[PDB]
Every structure is written in structure tokens, then in C-alpha cells.
Design a protein around this nucleic acid. Structure first.
Lengths: 97, 275, 88, 117, 66
RNA sequence: UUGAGUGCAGAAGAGGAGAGUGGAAUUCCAUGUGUAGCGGUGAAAUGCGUAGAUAUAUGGAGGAACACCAGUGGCGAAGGCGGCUCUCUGGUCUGUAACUGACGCUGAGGCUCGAAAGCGUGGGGAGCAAACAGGAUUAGAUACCCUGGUAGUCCACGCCGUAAACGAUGAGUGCUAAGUGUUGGAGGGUUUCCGCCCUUCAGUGCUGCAGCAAACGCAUUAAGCACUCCGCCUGGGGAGU
């Protein structure tokens, strides 16, 4: 079959909500292009940080779930486009079962 | 890669040369060409400016982009050729409007690629971007000094460049030899380091082969006469007496950091490491 | 390494009778496709010692089963070596 | 000057010597002492009595610029830190901090060798 | 003679759960060894990898006496 | 069909590549404060500081190894293998038996793998640190002590084929009292079992009976009882010359 992946990225809190919705729209539209399957889009917690990361001690936690064939281009596309934006602090992708 | 010729003669012993494995064709177009001369280091005034030049096979110019002002048009790339002019190989251009030129070759250009030159281009190697649209970390060439354009920084085969850190104005850029300066924020450039690599690893072998290049053998220092170079003369072999060894125009040749002391870039430049 | 679809499919195109998960035509066909894709891996990660050793094991074991195949019948043997592209 | 009465002290000691210094909550340096600073010699700079009199000489200069309350920083595990903080209280100040900042790595670099004495 | 984490049916830790995350850290923030935990030997590995996931995304700090 | 391999259902595991990345610690740069020492030893000196060190706080760079977990734990054939996460890939064990019907093991010469030191070729270089300097002890000191400090120490590719490459015990396979933990399964009883008790497979330890042994001692994981195959040895030196 395929895999299952959590993707939980850390957003700048100083952005608007329009930028938040635009970023959610953008990464959701680009991830569906490479054969990834959308499952769920949860805004986890408006949570602070136990220590500072780049310029913040807060942020936004947003988690999504996604299934995809393992050797498509629906992983490294996101890996390339994540850490070049400003509004992503950290993020992690783990296999899910 | 590199061929190694089997030793037939005594002169063909230590020979090395490239493969040119990655060249598609070798019949270039008409329109991009221009003719040339060989000045042989000689001015309008018929006198040798810089020594040791000239005397080789014919060459021609071609017209190569440095600006890439045509934007928002997909650029089909078909062939990679060789040019006599520059150390790096060069590739043709196809625009969907139908305009053709030449473009330098970073590592990883292929047949059938489509490069974008606009300010909104997807960040890949070969694309052309004004510098403010570019994040920190990439490798960038055809870096404009002053806008409008074109390349005057790193062009030849191999060498790389970094981006250390933005300011409002100007942009910091790390060049070769680790020497980092202030460069304007409205400049256009291209992503990715240069193509061919192994020109550090090619011998010449014959006197004839570097004479196929447009060069000329020199003469040693004290082997010169006792007049046309100040080391000269000497009975038998003699070591240098005039301390801190000298060029034939004054100017001793060990350790003179000799830019013009009051230049209009001196307030822009950090860490002159090694020149 | 291979997928369980074709793993369960080539055994169902090369079987003698029904349920022939033995039948050493079939085992050497399975080993054949396995050593093809493991050698494809050995192209890629050619510094990996701990799978080319497995190539050695699968090659030697297919050698052993194939050598035992001939010494009771050759017509199966001739048909397979005309069938699967081997025997140099 | 300026009557601050709210600062940070620093304790730093070796097997052979020690250092005390009191700074601000920023902390710009004010006044300091050591067993070599008070004039004791070399091998003798490990006795906690020397740490006592060094704390004396540090505080008697320190509090005169306007200083009562302070926090305590213990670097450099040596010997006399039992006596240094009590002799710090013995000149009448407001010691209220018992922490431990001590550099432990996560095995990034290498120590020196054994001693084949 | 010792407790365990399976009565509450431990099945899948899922990277975030403070109700088990906070139980086995130290006061300063270290790891409690299996002399102290009273748990299964594989669960040591599960929770060790679980809290090593925790130390990146800020959901538990490295050093804490402040 | 019992030995073998093949299904089928599962389980563990620092097994190997590639790719990006996380925190501290050290060291350097910059800034603030602060002035007379810092640092070293059995003891002292050479070293560093009044061109502001040592001290603290703040920001950047930059490699390097990965605290806690960690255990006679686990994985590999041995050299060995522990920050995280992802793409490919390899073995091990437990029920299972419809399927093949002995397809097995050892294995001269070959082929492959193979610590650290070492060479060659390009990068990179924080600490540590052969060679070397300087100080001290020492009658003596090129050594032990201290302050330094070069190659080297990492990465990319060939090369070399070596160790106290040790459980100083070659591999395959059956029989022969026990007790004792523990890794990982399988089965049954009570069982809300997840807490217990018993039964059976695969490792890993510790004490011991027969037996073996010159003793030391070994012992279901024989250094016992036997078969198959391979290798080795025949006094010490001269010399693995």
C-alpha cells in the first residue's frame, strides 16, 4: 500500500489570519499536485515555546495528515518549499501507523 | 572526464585531456557569431602592452546573455556546445516567441529544460532572479555589480559564491577566497555554480600545445641581460643581490597589497583574506 | 525487496500444478527477479557491503538448485535455460 | 553610586585558585577579589580562609556604592565555596540564591590526557 | 512489587501526550532510568525516542532550573 | 518425509548506504562594565595582561564529537555498530505445513570483506596532539612535569593488507544431573493478568553432578561421549633471518 505522514509546522504568530489561510491554501494546493492525498487539516494549538527558536517564544501549531506512495515526489517538494519561506519556523515529518 | 594517452613518444608521456562527453553537436548558428582579431598585446600605437601573447589557431566571438531582460517567457534549451572564447561550455536558447541567443552552463542543465528569468521564478539552477527574491543559502552567478550591465563577476569554469546575510541596503555576498563585500540590492543574477570542473587537472605536455593556445614562452629573470632586467648578468650562476626580488619595472613581487588606497569601494569590503 | 503482487504472480505463471511454491523452476524464477533488483540496488549504493553479500548468497543458492535440477531431468532444464536467459 | 541594591555576584574557583566578582543584573562589573589579589601565593590560594578574606575585601568595597541584595553564581567547582558564601553573609548582605551553572558538554570536544607524573 | 504503564493501556504514544511525557522526565529535565521507572524494557526505547522527538519542537526544554 | 529449502501469519533488533537537520559545550570575532593581575606545580619558573588580560553579559561565525537514556542490553561474519528524521536495501527468531522430494556439510588453489597507524590525489581544519621549541626537576634527562606548537587526527576516491584481528578454544551434527536470572516469542490455568503460576521454542550470563584433565580448571554455550571435512605441529637459538 502507501504511507501515512504527520506534518506539523510552526508558523510566525505576528502574521494575520489572511496570511495564515493563504499559507494553508498554498501548501495544500502544492502537496496535492504530486499524488499526495489530503486527510485532515487541524490547527493544533496556539501554543507558546519552552525556549526561543528563531525570533519567537510563541507560534502556531498546525498538523496535517497525508497518504502517498513512498517513491513519488510528494515529500521532497514540501521539504524544498518549507525551509525557504519565512513563515515556517520548524516542521517535522514522521511515518505514521 | 579525463583521458590518459598511452606513452608512445617521450613527449606524449605526461599528457591529460578532457573527454567532451557532454557536447551534443558542434555546428553552431550563423547569427550569434562575430569575428575577432588577435591584438598580440599591441595597441593602436603598435607597441607591446603586456608580454607573452599571440600566435595560434583562429577563433570567433559569440553573443552571450548577461542581462536576461526577457521575462515571463519559458526558455527551451536544446544543445550544449563548446566555444573557443571561455573556459566554460555554453548552451543555446529557444524562446517561445522565437528569439535565440547563448547562455552559460551551470552543472545540471539538460536538453528540454525550461528556465524562467522573471522576478517570480521558481528557485532552481539556471533561473534568473533579482537578488531580493532570493533567500539565504543558494549558489548564485552572473552577479551584477551595477544594474543594467549584466554579469561581470564570476564567469569561468568551476568557482562558486554564497549569500551570507541580507540587510536593507546593501546585500552581503561571499565570493571566492572568502572575501565578502557590500553589493546592491537591485541586481539580477543566476542560480548555481559553473559547469566544467577539471581544468585544474589537465596538462599541456608539448611546447606546441600551449602554443596552440595563444601564449608564448618567457625568459627567466637573471637569464636576461645585465640591462633589460635588473637581476641580470651574473658570472656563472649568481643569486639575487638586489633584495626583495624585483619585476622589470620596479615593483618587488613578494607581498604588495596594492590597490589604490582611496578607492570608492573601500567602505564596502570585509575580510580581504587571500590575494 | 520485491512486491508481494509479482512475488505471488510469477509463481502463478510458472507453476507445474496448483500450489507449486516449491517446484524448482519457480524458486529460481523468484531468485532471478530478486537478484535482478538487488543488483540494481548494488548499482546504486555500491558502498553497501551488507547487501552484495546477499547477492552472493542468492546467486550461490540458485546455482545449487539449478545444479540439482539437471541430474534427474534435462528437458525441464533445457526449457528453462532457453526460457530465462542464463547459462554462460 | 546610584543606590542599586539589586545585583549578581559570581563565584569561580579552581583546584589552585579562586575568583569572586559582583556585577549588576546585566551585569556591569563593580569590584572583585582573589587570593592572589589579596596577595597570597600560588599553592596557598586554595584555602577557604583566603576565600573568606577575599569575600570580605570584595563586599566591603561593593556595598559602599549602594548595595544590599544580590544573587549568587557558582561556577568552577573547587574547594572553598562552603566558606565563601557564609563569609559573604558575614559582612552583612542579602544572599538569596543557591544555583549551579557549571559547564557540562554533551561530549563535543576532547579533554587533555592523563597525568603520568 | 513495582508499577507499570500498561494498565492504562499503552498502545501508541503519538509524540505529544503530556500525561505520559511529564511522568518520566527528571525535575531538572533529565531521563529517569529503568531502576526508577518500573516499566517494560521495550517501553524504555519507545519513551526515549518519544521524548527525543519532544526536544525539537519546543514541547519540552533541554535545561531547566529557572 | 524427519534432513534441507519453499510457502503463510507475525515479532524483535546501535544491519548498511544516501539525504537534510536538532540542541548544548569548546574556540574566535564584536560590544558593555571593570582594573592589577591571570594561569601553572610537590614547589616554583618559562606563558598571558597597563596597546586593558583574567571576569560577566549580549550578538554573529565556525567546525568537531552526540550528555541523560545505557543495561553481562540488542544487531552483525569478524574488524565492530548508539542526536533526530526521511528514500532504497539486507539478514535472525516463533507457529505453520496444503507445496518440492534429500536439493546436505566441510571445502586445497581462487574471489570478496577487512580497526588504528600509512601513502597518493582534492576539500576542510574547533579542540586533541607524534616531531620540534622553551621553562622546571634531575649530577645527567633530547623522558616522566608545564606552557606551547607542525604533520596527523574529518570528509571525497584509489592504494596497503596488518593487531593481544582473544572466549589465545575451526566448522557441521546427535547423546548425557541439576539450580539460577535475563532477551524475544508461543501455549494453558486462574485471569478485569496489565498485574501471577506452569509448559515449550531461539540467544545470553552465574553456581555446580557424571565425565575430562599433569594441575590450573572446563562443563548443555563441554576443554565429556562419538562421526564427516579442513588447517596446523614435532627442542631452544641462529631467525620468520
Amino acid at each position: 500500500q502507501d504511507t501515512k505522514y504527520e506534518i506539523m509546522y510552526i508558523i510566525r504568530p505576528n502574521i494575520d489570519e489572511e496570511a495564515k489561510t493563504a499559507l494553508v491554501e498554498r501548501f495544500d494546493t502544492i502537496l496535492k499536485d504530486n499524488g499526495a492525498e489530503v486527510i485532515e487539516s487541524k490547527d493544533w494549538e496556539k501554543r507558546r515555546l519552552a525556549y526561543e527558536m528563531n525570533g519567537f517564544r510563541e507560534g502556531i501549531y498546525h498538523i496535517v495528515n497525508v497518504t502517498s506512495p513512498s517513491t513519488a515526489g510528494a515529500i521532497n517538494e514540501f521539504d524544498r518549499l518549507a525551509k525557504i519561506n519565512d513563515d515556517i519556523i520548524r516542521h517535522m515529518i514522521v511515518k505514521v501507523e | 572526464a579525463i583521458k590518459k594517452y598511452k606513452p608512445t613518444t617521450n613527449g606524449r608521456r605526461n599528457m591529460t585531456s578532457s573527454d567532451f562527453a557532454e557536447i551534443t553537436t558542434s555546428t553552431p548558428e550563423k547569427s550569434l557569431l562575430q569575428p575577432l582579431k588577435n591584438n598580440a598585446g599591441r595597441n593602436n600605437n603598435g607597441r607591446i602592452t603586456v608580454r607573452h601573447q599571440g600566435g595560434g589557431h583562429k577563433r570567433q566571438y559569440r553573443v552571450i546573455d548577461f542581462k536576461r531582460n526577457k521575462d515571463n517567457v519559458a526558455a527551451v534549451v536544446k544543445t550544449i556546445e563548446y566555444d573557443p572564447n571561455r573556459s566554460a561550455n555554453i548552451a543555446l536558447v529557444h524562446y517561445e516567441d522565437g528569439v535565440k541567443a547563448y547562455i552559460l552552463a551551470p552543472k545540471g542543465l539538460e536538453v528540454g529544460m525550461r528556465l524562467v528569468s522573471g522576478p517570480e521564478a521558481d528557485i532552481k539552477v539556471g533561473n534568473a532572479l533579482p537578488l531580493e527574491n532570493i533567500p539565504v543559502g543558494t549558489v548564485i552567478h552572473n552577479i551584477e555589480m551595477k544594474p543594467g550591465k549584466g554579469g561581470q563577476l564570476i564567469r569561468s569554469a568551476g568557482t562558486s559564491a554564497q549569500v551570507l546575510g541580507k540587510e536593507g541596503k546593501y546585500v552581503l555576498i561571499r565570493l571566492n577566497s572568502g572575501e565578502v563585500r557590500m553589493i546592491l540590492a537591485t541586481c539580477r543574477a543566476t542560480i548555481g555554480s559553473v559547469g566544467n570542473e577539471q581544468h585544474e587537472l589537465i596538462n599541456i605536455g608539448k611546447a606546441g600545445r600551449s602554443r596552440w593556445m595563444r601564449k608564448r614562452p618567457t625568459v627567466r629573470g637573471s637569464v636576461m641581460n645585465p640591462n633589460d632586467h635588473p637581476h641580470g648578468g651574473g658570472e656563472g650562476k649568481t643569486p639575487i643581490g638586489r633584495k626583495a626580488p624585483v619585476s622589470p619595472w620596479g615593483q618587488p613581487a613578494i607581498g604588495y597589497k596594492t590597490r589604490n588606497k582611496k578607492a570608492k569601494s573601500d567602505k564596502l569590503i570585509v575580510r580581504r583574506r587571500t590575494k | 525487496a520485491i512486491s508481494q503482487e509479482r512475488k505471488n504472480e510469477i509463481i502463478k505463471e510458472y507453476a507445474r500444478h496448483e500450489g507449486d511454491t516449491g517446484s524448482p523452476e519457480v524458486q529460481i524464477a523468484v531468485l532471478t527477479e530478486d537478484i535482478n533488483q538487488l543488483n540494481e540496488h548494488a548499482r546504486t549504493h555500491k558502498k553497501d557491503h551488507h547487501s552484495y553479500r546477499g547477492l552472493m548468497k542468492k546467486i550461490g543458492h540458485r546455482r545449487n538448485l539449478l545444479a540439482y535440477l539437471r541430474k534427474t531431468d534435462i528437458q525441464r532444464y533445457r526449457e528453462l535455460i532457453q526460457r530465462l536467459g542464463l547459462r554462460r | 553610586k546610584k543606590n542599586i541594591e539589586s545585583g549578581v555576584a559570581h563565584i569561580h574557583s579552581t583546584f589552585n585558585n579562586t575568583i569572586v566578582m559582583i556585577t549588576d543584573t546585566h551585569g556591569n562589573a563593580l569590584a572583585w577579589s582573589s587570593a592572589g589579589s589579596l596577595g597570597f601565593k600560588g599553592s596557598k590560594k586554595s584555602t577557604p580562609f583566603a576565600a573568606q578574606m577575599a569575600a570580605e575585601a570584595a563586599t566591603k568595597v561593593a556595598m559602599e556604592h549602594g548595595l544590599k541584595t544580590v544573587d549568587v553564581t557558582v561556577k568552577g567547582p573547587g574547594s572553598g565555596r562552603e566558606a565563601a558564601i557564609r563569609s559573604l553573609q558575614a559582612t552583612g548582605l542579602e544572599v538569596t540564591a543557591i544555583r549551579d551553572v557549571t559547564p557540562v558538554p554533551h561530549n563535543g570536544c576532547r579533554p587533555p590526557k592523563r597525568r603520568r607524573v | 512489587k513495582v508499577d507499570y504503564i500498561a494498565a492504562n493501556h499503552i498502545e501508541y504514544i503519538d509524540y505529544k501526550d503530556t500525561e505520559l511525557l511529564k511522568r518520566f522526565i527528571s525535575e531538572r529535565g533529565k531521563i529517569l532510568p529503568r531502576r526508577v521507572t518500573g516499566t517494560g524494557a521495550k517501553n524504555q526505547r519507545k519513551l526515549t525516542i518519544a521524548i527525543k522527538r519532544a526536544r525539537i519542537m519546543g514541547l519540552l526544554p533541554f535545561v531547566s532550573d529557572e
